[PDB]
Structures are given as C-alpha cells and as structure tokens.
C-alpha cells in the first residue's frame, strides 16, 4: 500500500474499529443489520473527528498562554470541500482507517463519496480562503477563519436538455459531523436604526437586532499537531399576530440562508450587504473581547485580512467600536485601524467592484456612512496636501462616487483604511500600481504589494493524487509535502526511465479511475486512450470557454474534410457553473452540449473526438478530474485573470498547460521554462493596442475561412436544427460586442493546439515535459504564499515545529 | 438518601463519571476550566442517554420478531416536559448519577434546571398524550407516538405591567440530546393539486410536495427494559429568481414551525389544516410500509388512536391509500378503516369543534373531500335504513354542515370512521351518549365507551415528589409505582402517628422548596406558614379563575371590615397561559395581578393574605408547585370540564380538593369519599334548570351585598385607580353575558372555602384527610387507563414483564 498515507498500527486499527462500532451503536443508534453506507460514513467521520479534539483544545490553549499575534481571515467564502480524507491525511490516520474499515468489510473510498461538500464559495477566491486556512495551520500561525455558515452553498448544477438547472445545495441535510455549535457564544448584530449625537459622542439606537451564532470547524495542520479554527456565523432571531410574528423570524434568519452565486459580478442586493455587515460585526466583537482577555497594542496583537472588499465594512466597524464604544479619539482610532487592516484585491473587471448606493448605507448602516464620509474627508485632505491643486485626482481617489445615484467605492475605502494592499500574482499586482490604483500607489507606494496565489499540496496532491505523491516520495522522501520547493529535486529524474514510466503509469491510472467515475455515476463513456483536454472553472466570457468551443468545432470540421488523416484522439471536457442570471454564460453551457450532440454522434468521427460537459463542478469533482487531465486549459484574455489557481492544480498533477500570458500563468511559465508550456495569443500589450484602434471582429471573420465556416454553422443552425437561431446572441456578441476578443486569439490558439497534439504523439517527450512541470510547481504552494503574508503584512514568523502529542 | 431512587453501585458511579468526562471532552469539546453548568448538564444528558440505546434497539427488534399488534397514537400534541430526570427514574440511575455528579463537585438538581421543556402541547390533551406514551411503555405495548416536531412549542409567558407577553419558545436553541434524526426515513406529503378520474380509478396529481423528516425520541418504561418510540415529523422543502426560490423554501418549512396556542378553541387556519394532514399522511405511510414488512389482517396488526379530531383526516387518508394506491374495493377498504380507527373526544364546548370549510378542503385536499362526501352518502344511507323517514336525524348526523359556508364536521367523520368513540371521564362519556352524540349512540351503541383519564405516577409522584414516594415506600414497598391501586394499603395508616407526622413533614419541605424557587428565580417572597391555595391550568372562562378572584377579593374585604378577627393565612397562587387572541383571558390575568397590587401592599393585611400569578405555567413548573400545594382549585362550571388531569396531580401529591361535581372530580370524590373533598356549587342538573329559565346575574347581585361590593370595586376602579374603567368588559360580561354562571356558585364557594379554612386550623385532621385522598388516588394512574384502552379498544393484553438486560 502507499507509505505516504502512513502506518496501520496494530493497536491503532483495533482501537479505530472499536470506536467505529461504538459510534454506530451510541451515536447513530444502528445495528449492522439496518446500517447503510451513509451510517458507515458517519461512524467513520465521528471516529476520525475524535482524534482532532485533544489537539484542538491544546492548540487554542497554547495560543492563550503564548499570546502571539492573532490573524483574522475575513471572507464571505470558504470553499472547503469534504473534510474526512483531509483530516485523516493531516493526522497520519489514512492507511490505518483504510485497514480498520477493510477489516470491518467496508471500502473507505466508497464511504468518502457520501460526504457532502462544504461548497461555501463560488470559485477561486473562496478556495484560496480554504487553502489559506490549511497553510496557516501547517505554518503554526494563530489564525482564525471568520465567515458565514450558509444554509445553502453554491447551487447544485444539473444539466437538462443541455441546459443548466439550479437546485438548492442542502448540504446540512444529514448533519455536519465536523462543526461544533457554540450557541453560548452568540452575539447581537444591529441593523437600521439611527444616530443620536450627544454627550459621550454618537449613539446608534433604535436598531433591529440579528443574533450571530458561531459554529467552529477544526482546521488541522499537516502532521504538526496544530488544529486551528474556522468560525462561521449563523443568523438567529432575537426574542400580524402571534403566529405571523413567530414565522417572520425567518426574515432575519434569511441573512445566513444562501451563498450569492455571483462569481466576479456585482449585484447590489441589500441582503448581500446585510451578509457582509453580519460577518464583520460579529467577528470584530470576538476580536475585541479576545483582545481584552488601551488600544495602542491592538495592531501588535491583531491582524485583520480582508478577502476582497466583501468584509470592507470591518474598517468603519472597527472605527465605530473604538470611537463610539471605547471612546478613543478619532486619530488614535484611525492609526489603530489602518495598522490592523490589510486588503486583498482579486480582479480588475469593473463590474465586480462593490459600489454601494449611499441611500442603502444610510438606511441600513447610518453610523457607518457618517464614519465613511469622515474617513473620506480626512483622506482627501491628505491627497490635497500631497498634490496641491490636483482636483481631478481628488474626484478619482474619492471614496464617494457621484452620479444619478451616489455610491461608496469599497475598494477605495479598503486602500484608505489598510496598511497593505495586495494583488494575487505579479502581473496583477503591478497593474494595480501602474493603472487602476495608480493614484493611491502615488500617495502611498509602501502600501502596495504582491502575494502570488497558491494551492495546498495536501488537498491538491497527497489527498487527490496519492499515486503521484507516492512515486515522488519514493525518490525524495516526504519533506516536500510541507516544503514544496523540494520538488525541484525531480528535475534530476528527467532521464530516469523508472520515473518516466511511473509518471505516465500514474496518469493512466487516474484516467481509468475518472472514466470509471463517469461510467458509474453518469453512464457516460470516455475513450481511455485519448488526450484528456480539460477546461474547468466558473463559466465566464473572460475565461473564454467559447474560444475552446471554436477549437472543438475546428477539429470536427477538419476531421470531416479529411476523414482519412490521423489525428490524436481527444476527450474534451468542459465544466463549471454559470451564475443563475448570467444569460450568456448559460447560452455557452448549452452550446457546449449542443456541439457534443453533433460531434459525439457522427460515425465518421467515432471515438477520435468527444465533447462532454462535466456537471456540477465543485471541489470534490476537481480532485477527481484534475489528476486525470493531460491538457490544462487556461485561456483567459490577457489582462483579465488576476492569478487563477486551477492552473496551479493542473501543473502540480501532471498536466501540461495551454494558456495565455495572463495571471499566474506567466510565473508558472517562468518557473518551468516557456519551452515547457504551450503559450499563445496576445499579451497584455497587444490587447491594449487593439483597444486603442478598436476591436473589429469582422476583420478576423473576413480573413479566416475556417472561422467564417464555424460562425455560419452557428448562425444557420447546424448545432440546433430544431431551433435554427438558438445561438444568435452568441454570434452577435462575438461579431459585434466581444469585450474579450475571442476571434483575435483564434488562429494562434488552433496552431498551438496543433503543437500540443504533435507532442502527445511522442509519449516519452510528453512525460519528460510533464516532469519539468511538476518539478517546478513548488512556488505555487500556499505555504509559500502564507509565509509571505506572515512576514510582509501580518508581521508574524511562521513555523513547522510539532506541538506535543 | 432515598431508596426509591435506587442504588449507587460503586462500579456504576465510576463508569458514569468516566463517561461524563468523556462526553465533556469529545461531545462538548470542553476542559473543566471553560465549562459552564450548561456544558455539565449536556455531558450528563449524553451519559444518561447512552443507557437507553441498547434497550431501544433491543425493544424495537423484539417487536419485529414477536410481531404483536402495533398501536399508533396520533396527536398534534405531546406535552413532554424535561426528560433527564424521567430517564434516570425509569432506568434506576438517579441515585447513581446523583453520587457521580456529587463526586465531580456538581449538584445534579442544579443541572436539571438547565433542561428546556419539550412544551409541544397546550394543556390537558397534550399532557395526557405524554402520560399515555409513558404508561404504554411501562405496560409493554408496541406503541408508537406520532406527532409534529414543532420548532416552537407553547409560547414562553412573561408578565409585564401585570399583563401577559408572548415570546417564542426556542426550545431547540442549544440542541435536543434526546431525539434522533432519521433523515433517511424522510417521506413526501402532498398538498393542493387535483383529481383525475380514469382507468385504475382516481389519481391525485399536480400536487405540491412537502417532505416529512422523522425525529425519534426514546420512551422508557418503568424499570422493565422497554424503550418505545415517539416519532415527530419535521417539514422540509423538496428539491422571483434563484435567491427568492431558495428563501421561499421557508413557506413549506413553516408547516412544522409553531404549535397553535389555542386550547379548546377552533380557529380554522389553513396552516393548522396543513399541520394536521402533514402528520396524518406521513404517519400512515409509515404504518403501511411497516405493515407490509392483502389488508384483511390490517386491523389485527394496526390500531390508530385519534387524540381528538385533530388527526381525523387519517380516516379519509387511509381510505385514499387503500382504494387509490392499493386498489381495494371501497367496502373492503371501509371495513378495514373502521376496525383500525378509534376516536377520543376531549370537550363538549361547541366552539372547540373542528368544522372545516368545504372550499378549503376542496382546495388543499381535493381527493379527501370526494372521499368524505362518499363516506357521508353511505353513512347517511345507513341512518336512513335504520330510521326510515327521520329526515332531521339525517341533517343532524350529516358529516356535511349547511350554512352561508358549508363545512365538514370532523367529530362526525371520526364517529362514522371509527369502531370506538370514548369520552375522558364517566360523566363526560355518558353525556356523549345522552345528548351531544345521542343520534350516533342510537345508530351504533356498541361504539360508545368511557376511558377515564389518568396521570403517570412516575412523573407525577416519584419524579416530582420523591419525599412522598419515599415515605409511602417505607410502609408498603415499591410495587405501587407501577401498580397504583396498592396506595389503598395506606388507609390503614390513618391513625399512624409516624405516617401522619411524615406526610405533614414532606408537604412542608415541598413548600419550603417552592418558596425558595420563587425567591431564587423571581425574588418573590411567600409566607411559608400559609395555606398554599393553587389554581393552575390554562386561563379560560369555563375554568373560572374569575370565581377564584371573587373569593380572594371577598377575603380581603372581610379582613378590612374586621381587622382583629383571626383568619388562616393564605398564599393564593394562580398560573396558566391565555391564548394570544383571547382578550378576556388576558384581562383576567391582569385582574389577578391587579388584585395582588392592592392586596399585597395593604399593611392591615400584612402576610395574612397574598395573591400571586405564577408566570409561565408549564410541565416543569407543575412538578414544582403541585407537591407544594395545600388546596387544589378545580372549580369549572358543572358540565364544562370533560375530565381534567391537574385535579389528579394534586390528589396524588397531598393537596385537598375544592371543586365542583364536574369531570373526573366526581370519580375522585367517589374514590375518596365525598366527606374527604370540598365539593360545592351547582351540579349539571342545576345548570340545565338555570338555562331553561335563563341565567340572570342581576338577581345574584341584587341579593348578595358582598358580591355587589366587589363588582363596584371593579367598576369604580378600586383595582386600577390609574385606569378606572380597565375592568369594564369583565364586569359587563359577568353582569350580562356570563356563559359559565360565576355569580350562581359564588355563595356556595365562599362558604365551602370557610370550611376549608376551618379544617386547616386542625393540622392533624387536615393531614388525616390528605391521607384518605392519597390512599385513594390509585384509580387515576394512566396505567389503569391505558390497560382499559388495550383490552377494550385496541384488543391487546398489557404486561409488566422485564425485557432482559
Ligand atoms: O456537534 C458536536 N457536539 C454536539 C453537542 C450536543 C449538544 C446538545 C445536544 C446534542 C449534542 N450532540 C452533539 O453531537 C461536536 C463535537 C465535535 C468535536 C469536533 Cl472536533 S467538531 C464537533 N462537533
Ligand atoms: O443525535 C444523535 N446522533 C447524531 C448523529 C450525527 C449525524 C451527523 C452529524 C452529527 C451527528 N451527531 C449526533 O449526535 C443521537 C444519538 C442518540 C441516542 C439516543 Cl437514545 S437519542 C439520540 N440522538
Ligand atoms: C471548484 C473550484 N472552482 C474554481 C477554482 C479556481 O479555478 P480557476 O483558477 O481555473 O478559476 C478551483 C480551484 C476549484 O477547486
Ligand atoms: C402544564 C400543564 N397544563 C395543563 C394540565 C392539565 O391541567 P387541568 O386538568 O387543570 O386543565 C397539566 C396537568 C399540566 O401539566
């Protein structure tokens, strides 16, 4: 069996079994005769959960007495996934549980498949939060994750008639064994009301209260005995007629009901604003109380990291508390606030920027608006002094945006109230300084940093790709698991026939296992001897699933033109959710399935090309498909993807990347060598030049016969005979309203895809290049990222020293 | 210590402690340093809960293989109270837990005070359901309780400015250690839709589904190793825009949200009808499936007991299922149904009768209405044949009621679709036959029975009055605990000086403990050397808390007239909830407090009379005040209280009763001797005679100067100087619209109260009479009642044989 999954200690197995059987009887109230695989999964989950407890108590108590600086990671999303396997891995219990369940006549992997994702995020930002909690525990940081316990996470996606359908993600249906309710640490949050300016200052009164009930989930570090805490707040009513009043409690409880499924788009829903304030206010009460267990030392004991502008109200909230309740002078309080807070920016796309209507803030959060105006005044006073007479800089830098409706720019608030501002990869971090926050960079250059994203090599290697983890371990030991730069040592195996063999063998095993999953779960058949070409990520125009579609159609039309000409077989897989209200994204999902309907049923094509849409892409599913992937599609328009992290997943798991010089793709290529990446298309510079003279898609259509053909297939109704004009909006958009310049990268992309195939025809040289990629993915460990946060922002030293027993 | 609470086994205590400490660590995730009394209560609850599990599995499996007839107790209410103490008592674990907690430095009674009531009932009917589940387990019956898991039970009553305020009863706030969720046994219930009459018969289609999620609570028998099941169903949504759709799931989930606080009043709310169908449909699916694990044998394997008309839809539901889904012929199905179902009637008051609008049933439950019309037709066909040409009997007996709005009489449906119909005490059961269901009794006399109510001597003696239980045990052993007629043996101790001493000593201890509770919990001071005179029960005109008020005012006015004349000191206590919309009941609560405001602050009165309103009367509080009570107020207007059961509580716990010849008061007096009860006022016969010539309260006012005085105190504003006419509605009602003839029993009552005092001045003879009452309360055991149900209705033999280990 696999040594990286640890020891199956004889007494450990015995004890595991005993405790499994104990929970089944006492916790589940079952005999082996009525018990289902779900009961078996939960008995395991409880048994495994018990091993966290001693460390969870010991860790938190150890922070109480060492009194290190506390890091508070505020996020509206934690995209956690399942936790059974992760717990076993970080606790060295995996092989032991596997044996114990084996002796009881159970298949542990089958049991793991019953666990529901905690899918309390939308995409990258949400998952980064999750990898970050993991890496902070593994680096021995006294770090707390602080969010919302959504009753419903990211919608369950079904595909019906080729179309996405949304169903509620009822993830707490059968209970959550991993969380611990702390109803005794419940806290009041206030909304609405108004401000009384009197004698000991301002007073926020006549508010409506919503209670915040914390639920704590354990966050285990990798084999270091550290167990940190994720605290997620749940909304509760405080204590028409009686019945209606009792039923109307739902209204306040709706605050924590459901994750907003808008990935990188701003919607301006009040219920969202309530969700943001809810998490901010409850969290800060916790931070202060725990601090108190004078505020000059506050930034020496407290860091607040803002995952985007979503918890940006933490800035006026802290000020409110310090000034109104603690009665600090404004200036004192503001020094404290800025040194406490730092802000992570995740995207440059204007429509994802949070700009809340002033009337809304005035109504829901009156005292916060006042405070925000006062912040603006003093901040623009600073601008004016540093740049005398520069009036336009003033209106550009202003927290307040003028227009038919006045709004507050929440990014501006964050920069003003934070000592550090970071982007999430080098290219993105620089553009913040150069253009989009150029003015702020000019006022305070020292605020601006880079922290290039990362993924945890626990989840994203050991967990999901134990076969790859094992052949690496066979060569270089297990230290790389929490020291991922050691993967560099694998470059020395690039001519090693055993390693070349094993790497290819591991990938083929992962492909077989994925095929089996699709057959099991969907009765979908995929050609195992095909290049698995995978684009998985949220469905957006900027991510250009449509470019991928153009290519797929290109391959189909080329096959039909020259049927007799050999092409490398491909299974092209696309997966990802569209926001329920983004019509275009939903049209693109349908187009993917509609291409499959033609392509996958053409006898002339047979098994040399398949196109399939992976339903319900989510963390658990990523862990299945990514280790199976040959080609990693990372084809955003240059300038549009701040970083990405799926890109990193694929690199770590033995896929080659086809991509643009966008986001962290650039650094990955730098790390591996551009010779070892399929880089294509416009650079940022070329996109800009095209914007200066204006993007005319018609030029590209008039000069490329293959593209012209595809577009006429779409228009004429070749991919929807029953509904000839089904795809007119997509055609119109591409021809006349394409913000992401799909046609401009078509040729370079198709050519680059030809090189991909060319290489794939040479298995040895494909695998050698893959080795060059794995060996060089170390930079993309989230431990690396978190240690830069710790040293460059939070001002804490990380550590991988074991806590005792 | 107390031997009736069992043995503190040395290894048992050791093990208890171990397991207490185990749960505190693994279940509560606490160290002894952060732990609160609430954590300590839950560690105990888990520790004690573990002792049910083996018996719960063993009991249910034993029913599977013995395959006895299953009893299904359908009730919209189970008024359970707390379960920690009850579990320890029935498991002989009380003294042991007390010692174990003692060795850990904890007071177990203090820990018990943290447990929230399961207050999922309103009053008598709800509590009878609870005593019944207990007695069925103790009699070894394969009995299932089937109801609704209300998110909110009976409202928490606060008193503010003398007025009742209602607050949500958030009883699941900190978790329910006692219940076990069975989400895997979730079931669909259908609403709305319409009927297709085709080929394999009718088809109910286009329904809206609400899921029913069962939660199972253990029901422990008294020391017989039996643990039966209470199954309570919780409403769940099945799987505007996305967000609103997810939020709109609340609407269906509102079905199980809150108990309707209408005690003995019919309101006609659709949400109520949904609650009734919900419980009926989910329950019957369970019954059928479990039966299947041909339907001629169905009544030999299934009894359905209907606790009032609330689950009366079980009758058309069973028919629906048998006919539409199982495709039995109508007649076959109807024979099955009638032999399965029996109906318990709880009140004769017309306004508590369920008569649902036909339009409502047509809309929510179309197929049920059809079936109900068909039932009516065939049933009235039977009437017509048995009573040819009797047309008015036809419209009187009809399930269908004519009027501006046509309704279905649910009582009529129950009698028609049930093989037995019972009242809840002898007098009530006879009046059903004589008058109110005279016509049905004449068609089918053999259907009509009596089952006089009872209370469990576990909860209502051993649990709540361990001191009384112990001195009884000292004389006659412990067999009486499940064989309550053995209390008769105590009549031989009526001249026993040790027993007389102990009985009085026990009561004084209970009074001290109650005083302490009021001082602790409310800083209310009561004179311990006073006669404790207690009227506790739901606030209603028929129960005549106002008569009690007249008396209290009488005593105050008599004191003030002759200050120097000795009177036996009294603390008069009134407690009970008013329905949020019953204005008059709410006015009566205020009047009680307002009398206290004058009386309790008159220096001339000092501590010789106090009037206090016991806030939040509920099962746990009954267990505190009833063992403390000297005088038990049971003063309903004759003819109006079908049985009562609080009356029985008081008799069992050493109070004397002042009462009318109403409900089970009559049988209690018969059991004890009328010499041993303070019986007063009109009998049913006198009430009737007064109705024939018309009740004129003015006569009573014009002939009784003391009454006249009190009424002028009310009118003139003596009990509300700030608001002189506060009590005008109460005055007007009593003078001109009194349905319950308060003035007609005033004189007899006041005189009878004089005899009460006369006796109380002779402690020995008071206690001897109390002995005569306790000794004769055996008939009022719910085991007795349940065994009559088992033998006379269900057709099963009860048993007190131990199940093994
Ligand atoms: O949910 C937990 N415990 C509760 C406590 C409770 C209180 C009242 C009623 C029932 C229960 N049952 C539990 O399992 C729980 C224990 C642990 C240990 C963890 Cl590590 S994460 C975690 N959650
Ligand atoms: O609530 C119980 N067990 C659950 C099972 C579960 C499933 C998923 C997630 C967490 C948990 N925790 C429990 O305590 C539970 C066990 C028992 C034993 C009883 Cl007797 S009454 C009773 N309730
Ligand atoms: C489920 C899920 N969604 C989104 C992402 C981010 O991927 P990308 O960088 O391709 O948008 C990841 C890594 C993932 O696990
Ligand atoms: C809390 C509670 N309410 C109501 C009742 C019934 O009492 P009564 O027969 O006096 O209405 C009881 C016994 C009780 O425990």
UniProtKB/Swiss-Prot annotation, chains A, B:
<comment type="function">
    <text>Allosteric enzyme that catalyzes the rate-limiting step in glycogen catabolism, the phosphorolytic cleavage of glycogen to produce glucose-1-phosphate, and plays a central role in maintaining cellular and organismal glucose homeostasis.</text>
</comment>
<keyword id="KW-0321">Glycogen metabolism</keyword>
<dbReference type="InterPro" id="IPR000811">
    <property type="entry name" value="Glyco_trans_35"/>
</dbReference>
<feature type="binding site">
    <location>
        <position position="31"/>
    </location>
    <ligand>
        <name>AMP</name>
    </ligand>
</feature>
<feature type="modified residue" description="Phosphoserine">
    <location>
        <position position="398"/>
    </location>
</feature>
<feature type="modified residue" description="Phosphoserine">
    <location>
        <position position="716"/>
    </location>
</feature>
<keyword id="KW-0021">Allosteric enzyme</keyword>
<keyword id="KW-0119">Carbohydrate metabolism</keyword>
<feature type="binding site">
    <location>
        <position position="64"/>
    </location>
    <ligand>
        <name>AMP</name>
    </ligand>
</feature>
<keyword id="KW-0808">Transferase</keyword>
<feature type="site" description="Can be labeled by an AMP analog; may be involved in allosteric regulation">
    <location>
        <position position="144"/>
    </location>
</feature>
<comment type="similarity">
    <text>Belongs to the glycogen phosphorylase family.</text>
</comment>
<keyword id="KW-0547">Nucleotide-binding</keyword>
<dbReference type="GO" id="GO:0030170">
    <property type="term" value="F:pyridoxal phosphate binding"/>
</dbReference>
<dbReference type="GO" id="GO:0098723">
    <property type="term" value="C:skeletal muscle myofibril"/>
</dbReference>
<feature type="modified residue" description="Phosphoserine">
    <location>
        <position position="482"/>
    </location>
</feature>
<keyword id="KW-0597">Phosphoprotein</keyword>
<comment type="subunit">
    <text>Homodimer. Homotetramer; to form the enzymatically active phosphorylase A.</text>
</comment>
<feature type="modified residue" description="Phosphoserine">
    <location>
        <position position="715"/>
    </location>
</feature>
<keyword id="KW-0663">Pyridoxal phosphate</keyword>
<feature type="modified residue" description="N6-(pyridoxal phosphate)lysine">
    <location>
        <position position="649"/>
    </location>
</feature>
<dbReference type="InterPro" id="IPR011833">
    <property type="entry name" value="Glycg_phsphrylas"/>
</dbReference>
<dbReference type="GO" id="GO:0000166">
    <property type="term" value="F:nucleotide binding"/>
</dbReference>
<feature type="modified residue" description="Phosphoserine; by PHK; in form phosphorylase A">
    <location>
        <position position="3"/>
    </location>
</feature>
<keyword id="KW-0328">Glycosyltransferase</keyword>
<dbReference type="GO" id="GO:0008184">
    <property type="term" value="F:glycogen phosphorylase activity"/>
</dbReference>
<feature type="modified residue" description="Phosphotyrosine">
    <location>
        <position position="215"/>
    </location>
</feature>
<dbReference type="GO" id="GO:0005980">
    <property type="term" value="P:glycogen catabolic process"/>
</dbReference>
<feature type="modified residue" description="Phosphotyrosine">
    <location>
        <position position="441"/>
    </location>
</feature>
<dbReference type="Pfam" id="PF00343">
    <property type="entry name" value="Phosphorylase"/>
</dbReference>
<dbReference type="InterPro" id="IPR035090">
    <property type="entry name" value="Pyridoxal_P_attach_site"/>
</dbReference>
<keyword id="KW-0007">Acetylation</keyword>
<protein>
    <recommendedName>
        <fullName>Glycogen phosphorylase, muscle form</fullName>
        <ecNumber>2.4.1.1</ecNumber>
    </recommendedName>
</protein>
<feature type="site" description="Involved in the association of subunits">
    <location>
        <position position="97"/>
    </location>
</feature>
<feature type="modified residue" description="Phosphotyrosine">
    <location>
        <position position="192"/>
    </location>
</feature>
<feature type="site" description="Involved in the association of subunits">
    <location>
        <position position="131"/>
    </location>
</feature>
């Amino acid at each position: 069996q696999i040594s990286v999954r640890g020891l199956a200690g004889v007494e450990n197995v015995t004890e595991l079994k005993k405790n499994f059987n104990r929970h089944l009887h006492f916790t589940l109230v079952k005999d082996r005769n009525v018990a289902t695989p779900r009961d078996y999964y939960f008995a395991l989950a409880h048994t495994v959960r018990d091993h966290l407890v001693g460390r969870w108590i010991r860790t938190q108590q150890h922070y109480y007495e060492k009194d290190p600086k506390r890091i508070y990671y505020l996020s509206l999303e934690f995209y956690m996934g399942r936790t059974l396997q992760n717990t076993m891995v970080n606790l060295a219990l995996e092989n032991a549980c596997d044996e114990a369940t084996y002796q009881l006549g159970l298949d542990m992997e089958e049991l793991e498949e019953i666990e529901e994702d905690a899918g309390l995020g939308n995409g990258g930002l949400g998952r980064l939060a999750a990898c970050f909690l993991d890496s902070m525990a593994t680096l021995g940081l006294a770090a707390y994750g602080y969010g919302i316990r959504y009753e419903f996470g990211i919608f369950n996606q079904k595909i019906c008639g080729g179309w996405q359908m949304e169903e509620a993600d009822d993830w707490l249906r059968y209970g959550n064994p991993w969380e611990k309710a702390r109803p005794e640490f419940t806290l009041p949050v206030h909304f609405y009301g108004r401000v009384e300016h009197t004698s000991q200052g301002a007073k926020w009164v006549d508010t409506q209260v919503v209670l915040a009930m914390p639920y704590d989930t354990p966050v285990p570090g990798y084999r270091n005995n550290v167990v940190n805490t994720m605290r997620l707040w749940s909304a509760k009513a405080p204590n028409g007629g009686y019945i209606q009043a009792v039923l109307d409690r739902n209204l306040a409880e709706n605050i924590s009901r459901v994750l907003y499924p808008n990935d990188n788009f701003f919607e301006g829903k009040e219920l969202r604003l309530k969700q943001e304030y809810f998490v901010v206010a409850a969290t800060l009460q916790d931070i202060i109380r725990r601090f108190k267990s004078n505020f000059d030392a506050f930034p020496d004991k407290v860091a607040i990291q803002l995952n985007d502008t979503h918890p940006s109200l933490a800035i006026p909230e802290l000020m409110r508390v310090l000034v109104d309740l603690e009665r600090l002078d404004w200036d004192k309080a503001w020094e404290v606030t800025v040194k406490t807070c730092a802000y992570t920016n995740h995207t440059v796309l204007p429509e994802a920027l949070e700009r809340w209507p002033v009337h809304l803030l005035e109504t829901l959060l009156p005292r916060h608006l006042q405070i925000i105006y006062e912040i603006n005044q003093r901040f623009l006073n600073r601008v004016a002094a540093a740049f005398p007479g520069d009036v336009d800089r003033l209106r550009r830098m202003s927290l307040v945006e003028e227009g038919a409706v006045k709004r507050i720019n929440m990014a501006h608030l964050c920069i003003a109230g934070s000592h550090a501002v970071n982007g999430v990869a080098r290219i993105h971090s620089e553009i913040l300084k150069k253009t989009i926050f150029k003015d702020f960079y000019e006022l305070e250059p020292h605020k601006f940093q880079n922290k290039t994203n990362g993924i945890t090599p626990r989840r994203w290697l050991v967990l999901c790709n134990p076969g790859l983890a094992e052949i690496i371990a066979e060569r270089i030991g297990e230290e790389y698991i929490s020291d991922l730069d050691q993967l560099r040592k694998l470059l020395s195996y690039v001519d090693d026939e055993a390693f070349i063999r094993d790497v290819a063998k591991v990938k083929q095993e992962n492909k077989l296992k994925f095929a089996a999953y699709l057959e099991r779960e969907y009765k979908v058949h995929i050609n195992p001897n095909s290049l698995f070409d995978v684009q998985v990520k949220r469905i957006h125009e900027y991510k250009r699933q449509l470019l991928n579609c153009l290519h797929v159609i290109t391959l189909y039309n080329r096959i039909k033109k020259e049927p007799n000409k050999f092409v490398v077989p491909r299974t092209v897989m696309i997966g990802g959710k569209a926001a329920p209200g983004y019509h275009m994204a939903k049209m693109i999902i349908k187009l993917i399935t509609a291409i499959g309907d033609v392509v996958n049923h053409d006898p002339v094509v047979g098994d040399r090309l398949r196109v399939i849409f992976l339903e319900n892409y989510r963390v658990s599913l990523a862990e299945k498909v990514i280790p199976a992937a040959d080609l990693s599609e990372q084809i955003s328009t240059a300038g549009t993807e701040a970083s990405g992290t799926g890109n990193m997943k694929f690199m770590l798991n033995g896929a080659l990347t086809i991509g643009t010089m966008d986001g962290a793709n650039v650094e990955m290529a730098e790390e591996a060598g551009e010779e070892n990446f399929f880089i294509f298309g416009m650079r940022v510079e070329d996109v800009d030049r095209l914007d200066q003279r204006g993007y005319n898609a018609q030029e590209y259509y008039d000069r490329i016969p293959e593209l012209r053909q595809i577009i006429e297939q779409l228009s004429s109704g070749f991919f929807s005979p029953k509904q000839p004009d089904l795809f007119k909006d997509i055609v119109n958009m591409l021809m006349h309203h394409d913000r992401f310049k799909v046609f401009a990268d078509y040729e370079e992309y198709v050519k680059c895809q030809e090189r991909v195939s060319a290489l794939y025809k040479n298995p040895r040289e494909w695998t050698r290049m893959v080795i060059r990629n794995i060996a060089t993915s170390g930079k993309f460990s989230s431990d690396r990222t978190i240690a830069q946060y710790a040293r460059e922002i939070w001002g804490v030293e990380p550590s991988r020293q074991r806590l005792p027993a």
